[PDB]
C-alpha cells in the first residue's frame, strides 16, 4: 500500500516515549 | 541531553574499577566489552571496534575512566538522543512541516511502544502544542524534552 512505514513507525514511537517520561520528572521536581 | 548523573557516574566508576589492574583509573581495549557486560550491556564486536577506533586512536591498547564514560553516554543516547527523537518524529510528520497533528501524536503514543496513560498523553499535548489548537510542534518539543 502507498505510504507504508509500520516497521519504522512502531519503533520510532518508543524513542519519544523514553524522552517524554524522562521529561515528566521535571514537571514534578523538588522546589 | 547526554550528561551523566552522579548515580550513573558512581555505577560506571565501580564497574570500571572492577577491571582496573593498578588503581590508576584505566583498563585494556580487551576488557572494555567485559566491563560493559558488568553493567549488563552485551555489545557487538563491531560496536567495540568502532568505539575503540575513536578512543584508542594512538593504538595504546588502553582506555581511561573518562574515555569509557564518553562512550557510555552515547550508548545510553541510542534510545533518547535529540537526533534520534527528531528522526523518530519525522517518521510521523505527514508533510515535512516540522510539526505533528495532536490527534496523530496521541494515536502513535497510545498505539505503539510502551503506551502513555490517558492523562499522560493528554499532558503531552498541553506542552507539545504551543496553545492547544490541535497541532504539536515536535521540533520545539524535542528540544524541551532533551534540555536540562
Swiss-Prot record, chain A:
What the entry says about post-translational processing?
May be ubiquitinated by NEDD4L; which would promote its endocytosis.
Q: What is the effect of changing residue 6 to T?
A: Found in autism; uncertain significance
Q: For the IQ domain, which residue ranges apply?
A: 9-31
Q: Where in the cell is it found?
A: Cell membrane
Disease implicated: Seizures, benign familial infantile, 3: A form of benign familial infantile epilepsy, a neurologic disorder characterized by afebrile seizures occurring in clusters during the first year of life, without neurologic sequelae. BFIS3 inheritance is autosomal dominant. Developmental and epileptic encephalopathy 11: An autosomal dominant seizure disorder characterized by neonatal or infantile onset of refractory seizures with resultant delayed neurologic development and persistent neurologic abnormalities. Patients may progress to West syndrome, which is characterized by tonic spasms with clustering, arrest of psychomotor development, and hypsarrhythmia on EEG.
Q: What is known of its domains?
A: The sequence contains 4 internal repeats, each with 5 hydrophobic segments (S1, S2, S3, S5, S6) and one positively charged segment (S4). Segments S4 are probably the voltage-sensors and are characterized by a series of positively charged amino acids at every third position.
Similarity annotation: Belongs to the sodium channel (TC 1.A.1.10) family. Nav1.2/SCN2A subfamily.
Described by its record, this protein's role is as follows: Mediates the voltage-dependent sodium ion permeability of excitable membranes. Assuming opened or closed conformations in response to the voltage difference across the membrane, the protein forms a sodium-selective channel through which Na(+) ions may pass in accordance with their electrochemical gradient. Implicated in the regulation of hippocampal replay occurring within sharp wave ripples (SPW-R) important for memory.
What quaternary structure, including any partners, is listed in this protein's UniProt entry? Heterooligomer of a large alpha subunit and a smaller beta subunit. Heterooligomer with SCN2B or SCN4B; disulfide-linked. Heterooligomer with SCN1B or SCN3B; non-covalently linked. Interacts with NEDD4L. Interacts with CALM. Interacts with TMEM233. Interacts with the conotoxin GVIIJ. Interacts with the spider beta/delta-theraphotoxin-Pre1a. Interacts with the conotoxin KIIIA. Interacts with the spider protoxin-II.
Q: What is this protein called?
A: Sodium channel protein type 2 subunit alpha
Native organism is: Homo sapiens
Gene name, per UniProt, is SCN2A
Q: Which residues of the full protein are shown?
A: 1901 to 1927 of 2005
Swiss-Prot record, chain B:
CDD domains in the record: EFh (cd00051)
Where do the annotations place Ca(2+) 1 binding? 20, 22, 24, 26, 31
Q: Which residues carry this modification: N6,N6,N6-trimethyllysine?
A: 115
Region of interest: Necessary and sufficient for interaction with PCP4: 76-148
What is the location of the Glycyl lysine isopeptide (Lys-Gly) (interchain with G-Cter in SUMO2) cross-link? Answer: 21
User: Cross-link Glycyl lysine isopeptide (Lys-Gly) (interchain with G-Cter in ubiquitin) maps to which residues of the chain?
Assistant: 21
Task: List residues modified as N6-methyllysine.
Answer: 115
Q: What are the UniProt keywords, alphabetically?
A: Acetylation, Calcium, Cell projection, Cilium, Cytoplasm, Cytoskeleton, Disease variant, Flagellum, Host-virus interaction, Isopeptide bond, Long QT syndrome, Metal-binding, Methylation, Phosphoprotein, Repeat, Ubl conjugation
InterPro entries on file = CALM/Myosin/TropC-like (IPR050230), EF-hand-dom_pair (IPR011992), EF_Hand_1_Ca_BS (IPR018247), EF_hand_dom (IPR002048)
Q: How is its activity regulated?
A: (Microbial infection) Inactivated by S.flexneri OspC1 and OspC3 proteins, which specifically bind the apo-form of calmodulin, thereby preventing calcium-binding and activity.
Which positions bind Ca(2+) 2? 56, 58, 60, 62, 67
Entry's localization field:
Cytoplasm, Cytoskeleton, Spindle; Cytoplasm, Cytoskeleton, Spindle pole; Cytoplasm, Cytoskeleton, Microtubule organizing center, Centrosome; Cell projection, Cilium, Flagellum
Annotated GO biological process: autophagosome membrane docking; calcineurin-mediated signaling; cellular response to interferon-beta; cellular response to type II interferon; detection of calcium ion; G protein-coupled receptor signaling pathway; G2/M transition of mitotic cell cycle; long-term synaptic potentiation
Superkingdom of this protein's organism: Eukaryota
Family statement: Belongs to the calmodulin family.
Q: What is known of its domains?
A: The N-terminal and C-terminal lobes of CALM bind to the C-terminus of KCNQ1 in a clamp-like conformation. Binding of CALM C-terminus to KCNQ1 is calcium-independent but is essential for assembly of the structure. Binding of CALM N-terminus to KCNQ1 is calcium-dependent and regulates electrophysiological activity of the channel. The C-lobe interacts with KCNN4 channels in a calcium-independent manner, whereas the N-lobe interacts with the S4-S5 linker of KCNN4 in a calcium-dependent manner playing a role as calcium sensor and gating the channel.
The remark listed among the other comments is: This protein has four functional calcium-binding sites.
Q: What is the name of this protein?
A: Calmodulin-1
Q: Which organism is it from?
A: Homo sapiens
What gene is behind this protein? CALM1
Amino acid at each position: 500500500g502507498p505510504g507504508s512505514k509500520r516497521k519504522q513507525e512502531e519503533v520510532s514511537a518508543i524513542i519519544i516515549q523514553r524522552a517524554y517520561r524522562r521529561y515528566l520528572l521535571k514537571q514534578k521536581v523538588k522546589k | 541531553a547526554d550528561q551523566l548523573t552522579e548515580e550513573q557516574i558512581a555505577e560506571f566508576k565501580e564497574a570500571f574499577s572492577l577491571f582496573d589492574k593498578d588503581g590508576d583509573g584505566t583498563i585494556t581495549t580487551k576488557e572494555l566489552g567485559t566491563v560493559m557486560r558488568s553493567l549488563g550491556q552485551n555489545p557487538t564486536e563491531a560496536e567495540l571496534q568502532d568505539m575503540i577506533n575513536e578512543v584508542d586512536a594512538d593504538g595504546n591498547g588502553t582506555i581511561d575512566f573518562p574515555e569509557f564514560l564518553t562512550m557510555m553516554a552515547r550508548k545510553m543516547k541510542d534510545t533518547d538522543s535529540e537526533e534520534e527523537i527528531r528522526e523518530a518524529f519525522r517518521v510521523f510528520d505527514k508533510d515535512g512541516n516540522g510539526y505533528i497533528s495532536a490527534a496523530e501524536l496521541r494515536h502513535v503514543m497510545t498505539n505503539l511502544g510502551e503506551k502513555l496513560t490517558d492523562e499522560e498523553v493528554d499532558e503531552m499535548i498541553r506542552e507539545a502544542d504551543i496553545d492547544g489548537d490541535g497541532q504539536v510542534n515536535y521540533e520545539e518539543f524535542v528540544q524541551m524534552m532533551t534540555a536540562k
